[PDB]
Amino acid sequence: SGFRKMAFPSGKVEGCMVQVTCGTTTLNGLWLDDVVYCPRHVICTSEDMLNPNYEDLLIRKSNHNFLVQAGNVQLRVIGHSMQNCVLKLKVDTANPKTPKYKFVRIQPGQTFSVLACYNGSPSGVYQCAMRPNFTIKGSFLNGSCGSVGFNIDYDCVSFCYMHHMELPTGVHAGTDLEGNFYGPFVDRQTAQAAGTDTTITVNVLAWLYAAVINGDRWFLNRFTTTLNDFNLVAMKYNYEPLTQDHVDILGPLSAQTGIAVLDMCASLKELLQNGMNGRTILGSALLEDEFTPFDVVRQC
Amino acid sequence: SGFRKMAFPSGKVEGCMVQVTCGTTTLNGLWLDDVVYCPRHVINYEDLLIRKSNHNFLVQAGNVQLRVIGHSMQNCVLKLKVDTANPKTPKYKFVRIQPGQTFSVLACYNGSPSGVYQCAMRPNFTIKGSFLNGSCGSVGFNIDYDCVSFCYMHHMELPTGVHAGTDLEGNFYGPFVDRQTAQAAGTDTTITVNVLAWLYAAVINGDRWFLNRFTTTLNDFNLVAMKYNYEPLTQDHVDILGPLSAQTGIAVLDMCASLKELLQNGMNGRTILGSALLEDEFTPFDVVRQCSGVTF
Numbered sequence: 001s002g003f004r005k006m007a008f009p010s011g012k013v014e015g016c017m018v019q020v021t022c023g024t025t026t027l028n029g030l031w032l033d034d035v036v037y038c039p040r041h042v043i044c045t046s047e048d049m050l051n052p053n054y055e056d057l058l059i060r061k062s063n064h065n066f067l068v069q070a071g072n073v074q075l076r077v078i079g080h081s082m083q084n085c086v087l088k089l090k091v092d093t094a095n096p097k098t099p100k101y102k103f104v105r106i107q108p109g110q111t112f113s114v115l116a117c118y119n120g121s122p123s124g125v126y127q128c129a130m131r132p133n134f135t136i137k138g139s140f141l142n143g144s145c146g147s148v149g150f151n152i153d154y155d156c157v158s159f160c161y162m163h164h165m166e167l168p169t170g171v172h173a174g175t176d177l178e179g180n181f182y183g184p185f186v187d188r189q190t191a192q193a194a195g196t197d198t199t200i201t202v203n204v205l206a207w208l209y210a211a212v213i214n215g216d217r218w219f220l221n222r223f224t225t226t227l228n229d230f231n232l233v234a235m236k237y238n239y240e241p242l243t244q245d246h247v248d249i250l251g252p253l254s255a256q257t258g259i260a261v262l263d264m265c266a267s268l269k270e271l272l273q274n275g276m277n278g279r280t281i282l283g284s285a286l287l288e289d290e291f292t293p294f295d296v297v298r299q300c
Numbered sequence: 301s302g303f304r305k306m307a308f309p310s311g312k313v314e315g316c317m318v319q320v321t322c323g324t325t326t327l328n329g330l331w332l333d334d335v336v337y338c339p340r341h342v343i344n345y346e347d348l349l350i351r352k353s354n355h356n357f358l359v360q361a362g363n364v365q366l367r368v369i370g371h372s373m374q375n376c377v378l379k380l381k382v383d384t385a386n387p388k389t390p391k392y393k394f395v396r397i398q399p400g401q402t403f404s405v406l407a408c409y410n411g412s413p414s415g416v417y418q419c420a421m422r423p424n425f426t427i428k429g430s431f432l433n434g435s436c437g438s439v440g441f442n443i444d445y446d447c448v449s450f451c452y453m454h455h456m457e458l459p460t461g462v463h464a465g466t467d468l469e470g471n472f473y474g475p476f477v478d479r480q481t482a483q484a485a486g487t488d489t490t491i492t493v494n495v496l497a498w499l500y501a502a503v504i505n506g507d508r509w510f511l512n513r514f515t516t517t518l519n520d521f522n523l524v525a526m527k528y529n530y531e532p533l534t535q536d537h538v539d540i541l542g543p544l545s546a547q548t549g550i551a552v553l554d555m556c557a558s559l560k561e562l563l564q565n566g567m568n569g570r571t572i573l574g575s576a577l578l579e580d581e582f583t584p585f586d587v588v589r590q591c592s593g594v595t596f
């Protein structure tokens with residue numbers, strides 16, 4: 001019993017964190033086999049950030065300009081290449097702590113653990129989700145760039161995010177491990193703003209099923225709804241549309257609790273209309289959207 | 301920017317988790333040097349233990365079976381002497397924490413770490429954890445520099461869904477016993493010094509709507525706080541909040557008048573750090589650590 005925001009154990013990722021220095025800029029790198037992956041803006045000065053020409057900046061660099069430090073040991077850079085917004089530094093030593101891993105690009109609504117690092121040293125681990133507007137609501141300070149997001153399903157680490165920047169509203173933007181940004185962002189100091197954010201509907205419904213599994217039923221009702229009527233109501237509260245794929249994904253939790261997805265959609269509509277009335281659901285006074293249907297089944 | 305419930309990196313603890321089986325019972329153990337620590341309920345405990353032999357305890361570290369060469373009981377923890385020292389044993393200490401203090405939990409099943417979360421020792425000595433059957437022996441910890449301080453070992457779930465356990469010397473937190481009997485957590489209270497620390501974290505992050513021009517005496521604040529089931533605020537707590545008070549320019553008793561108005565009037569449809577409730581599971585040290593980026 002109980003329901004917590006749970007992160008994956010970070011050990012397999014801690015053994016991969018290194019510090020990367022280029023000129024006056026220092027950030028974090030991910031050392032897997034003989035390659036260190038880091039944001040390409042490590043080659044930039046703050047002056048270069050408005051309109052950097054990364055190809056022009058990188059051709060001017062030599063291997064010995066990149067200072068890589070793994071713990072108290074200096075790694076030797078023997079090559080470099082740029083792949084989208086990530087720099088891949090070939091090193092002379094393979095990481096003996098390299099776990100079984102994959103690079104995965106996630107969709108909005110998906111959750112992952114973040115190992116926040118500074119100077120190649122892990123400082124903390126927290127759980128978060130890719131927002132519908134492609135930002136993450138992280139907890140990051142200057143020097144956290146290169147900190148990674150991951151999932152550990154079984155013994156394989158799936159790296160899905162690398163931190164690159166903080167937007168003016170305090171939210172964060174980054175790329176997958178192939179250097180492709182999530183969202184319409186660029187690694188440039190230019191007028192960029194996150195689009196209006198919305199609530200991850202399929203995740204709130206999963207969390208309502210978690211509340212039912214944990215004994216809480218106060219919010220249930222005798223009503224059902226059509227998917228279209230639910231979406232018409234949900235849009236008004238800045239909730240993401242619920243698709244038939246989401247209804248299908250909620251099938252197992254619906255079968256376990258005996259509450260049809262559209263019946264649970266009707267409790268959600270009522271909660272949006274009424275508020276919580278001094279009550280809580282799983283210790284929260286707000287509707288939680290950072291637990292996927294998969295996370296609920298795994299934890300409960 | 302941003303404020304998350306953050307746990308310590310769990311790596312140094314993952315390398316210590318093992319599975320312990322005795323008869324039909326399987327739970328988790330903590331392998332430090334040549335000793336495996338686990339809840340004694342895995343087996344009148346001294347009468348039950350005298351009947352056991354070393355080979356009855358099946359200890360598994362990954363895909364390797366460890367040989368038990370001895371055993372002893374210390375309070376509610378069983379200490380299994382093994383023939384192999386853990387090469388991954390980190391620098392560690394066993395520490396007993398106070399209510400209000402926070403720690404990270406590495407939840408395990410079958411000696412395998414499944415998750416890490418951050419939590420607080422409630423004033424009623426329970427923890428609001430997330431645990432299923434088989435989680436027993438999962439440990440709570442903090443990290444100071446490169447030293448792991450083990451402070452909690454999970455033993456059981458109470459009827460209300462909250463959890464109870466011991467320090468690593470086997471002493472329970474709270475008035476609990478490790479047996480099947482009618483036990484209930486006492487009425488819980490809010491950790492006042494922690495809510496104030498989280499209000500300072502909100503100010504540091506740009507959330508100031510709850511600030512007011514007023515101040516209060518410590519006595520008047522405590523008279524009001526005792527009415528809302530909030531823990532008393534001591535002069536030690538006021539002293540501990542000193543650094544955050546100096547950084548934000550808001551005196552502790554000035555922040556108390558804000559908390560008093562929040563208790564009497566409510567949040568009024570507003571949120572603080574994305575929450576509609578007052579959060580009490582961040583200590584003043586956790587706030588300074590997260591808002592400064594201390595590493596391990």
Ligand SMILES: CN(C)CCOc1ccc2c(NC(=O)Cc3cccc(Cl)c3)cncc2c1
Nearest residue numbers: 041049140141142144164165166187188189301
């Ligand atoms: C001042 N106040 C907002 C405190 C927090 O300050 C910060 C300041 C910087 C942060 C950061 N770094 C960058 O954004 C660097 C950068 C700049 C332009 C483009 C790119 Cl691609 C990269 C990352 N994460 C968090 C950061 C919090």
Ligand SMILES: CN(C)CCOc1ccc2c(NC(=O)Cc3cccc(Cl)c3)cncc2c1
Nearest residue numbers: 001341431432433435436455456457478479480
């Ligand atoms: C509510 N229930 C239907 C679902 C959750 O099931 C549980 C069931 C058991 C849980 C558990 N184990 C024990 O309590 C075992 C035990 C029994 C009596 C005395 C002692 Cl000292 C130990 C630990 N942590 C979580 C547990 C969640």
Ligand SMILES: [Cl-]
Nearest residue numbers: 105106107110
């Ligand atoms: Cl995905």
